[PDB]
Amino acid sequence: GGIWWFFTLIIISSYTANLAAFLTVERMESPIDSADDLAKQTKIEYGAVKD
Amino acid sequence: DGKYGAQDDKGQWNGMVKELIDHKADLAVAPLTITHVREKAIDFSKPFMTLGVSILYRKPNGTNPSVFSFLNPLSPDIWMYVLLAYLGVSVVLFVIARALSTRIIGGIWWFFTLIIISSYTANLAAFLTVERMESPIDSADDLAKQTKIEYGAVKDGATMTFFKKSKISTFEKMWAFMSSKPSALVKNNEEGIQRTLTADYALLMESTTIEYITQRNCNLTQIGGLIDSKGYGIGTPMGSPYRDKITIAILQLQEEGKLHIMKEKWWRGSGCPEEENKEASALGIQKIGGIFIVLAAGLVLSVLVAV
């Protein structure tokens, strides 16, 4: 019963940790909100209609 | 000459461009840069293929499928200290049994267990977060923003010349890095390959060569898509309709798809293995799991039924 206890503890802890990691990284991730962001970056493709 | 060929400053040409201009050779059969100066100097057919610059890098390391790597966020000495404390509590309870003190000791043990499990959970969470909050480098913009990792391109190469006339944030950052540190630039592709093999070095060069060497090597990897368009055209004499005759002939070849089959005749054939760690996850591997084997330890006592 005690080793089952420890298993349950560790598995729930890992579950909490990874989901919280996803939530935190989603919170710190910010999308583009200005053309300055496009100008400084190069990893996102962009364009305009010619003429 | 031992190079593609170029006019430096005197209006004179060398290599395949000079030979085609002189019309002592009728076509250039090799990879060949397409620049406006040489395009005006010598006409080019439509490229038989288009390519850019890619990143050669060392294979990521750190695959440790071990049970010890699962209890990592815990000092084992502290774990044995907790075990000794628990057994001491149990023996104290056993000897005292020969009331309210028992309950209060159980409660304080409950509180210590809460504290220790909280600490373990927090430590493991921090370790996994700091692991996965960082990602392997996938773009040259990442190279530009970082400075801890050496990177470079073959000097006097096509990528160097293209970046000379290309001024985008990452490109002048690259040029500043090249000027600052001459120890991260080479004159030959093999030298850069050796640099990548020895140190964690990022190499930028024409994509096809990197694809070939990656498919002829197992200790290296390619990362990043095309960051530029280069193209490899075919030379043609001045005022030659055969230029068009080349172009259409090339066009149907792309429709025939023979170029791909022959490229895999030369390029592919690699047998590099695959891993599940490329998607930035640790779930579903001995890094998360592996203690089910420890369960059998208790099972051996589970068969004693009589004395």
Place this chain on the structure above:
Amino acid sequence: GGIWWFFTLIIISSYTANLAAFLTVERMESPIDSADDLAKQTKIEYGAVKDGATMTFFKKSKISTFEKMWAFMSSKPSALVKNNEEGIQRTLTADYALLMESTTIEYITQRNCNLTQIGGLIDSKGYGIGTPMGSPYRDKITIAILQLQEEGKLHIMKEKWWRGSGCEENKEASALGIQKIGGIFIVLAAGLVLSVLVAV
């Protein structure tokens, strides 16, 4: 029992969350390993002597790291020192990061036991000797110095002239070091003795 159970659950949950938040924030970034650490953190003030060769190099360099470093040092005048000795003293006494020619920090660390050289090699500038025009002696001293280079004499002179090298810990196996359970042991022993006092 249910209301006390919910109370206990929520309070211990808050405790665990705060614990995790603390260790993470101290562990989410390294104490110091390179100028990139200064690039992504700002808890340590950094700078150099005003109008020094370092800040001129930062101005002329197009490395976005050095660019933002220059922007920061221009933003805060408190990170500016009129003289290198003042910056050395303030780094030795208070939290401050000084950027200077590598051999200077080399000598200082050789002549110190508390401060340390920080960061690997980042620039390639070097020192030479000024030469007039039309002086073949420049060519002679060039070839002579090159000869000394394959002779390795410069190492001999620098070790002879620079030698003061004085006297770390990792402590990364659990949260907030190994020294973290002593209070638990003490409180455990204190609660242990409380059971023997009474005879009932």
Place this chain on the structure above:
Amino acid sequence: LGVSILYRKPNGTNPSVFSFLNPLSPDIWMYVLLAYLGVSVVLFVIAR
């Protein structure tokens, strides 16, 4: 008016109503179920 960046809605979602097979790998849940099944019968066979 000025100029405006055109982009799709921020990609990312959760397949309803699963919210635990996405954070945790399913094989982990399968192993946990197997362990629960294995430990279940031990007490019954021992007590009998």
Place this chain on the structure above:
Amino acid sequence: KLHIMKEKWWRGSGCPEEENKEASALGIQKIGGIFIVLAAGLVLSVLVAV
């Protein structure tokens, strides 16, 4: 040039870095939640006493 002129005459004052997440000596954010359970116990005690 109008944008450059505005930036010249609307170049603000620099601000210290303040978006870095910080967590140190954080308690229960002043008030806790013990009052609800205290009130629940008191209110139930009077009429369990019947």
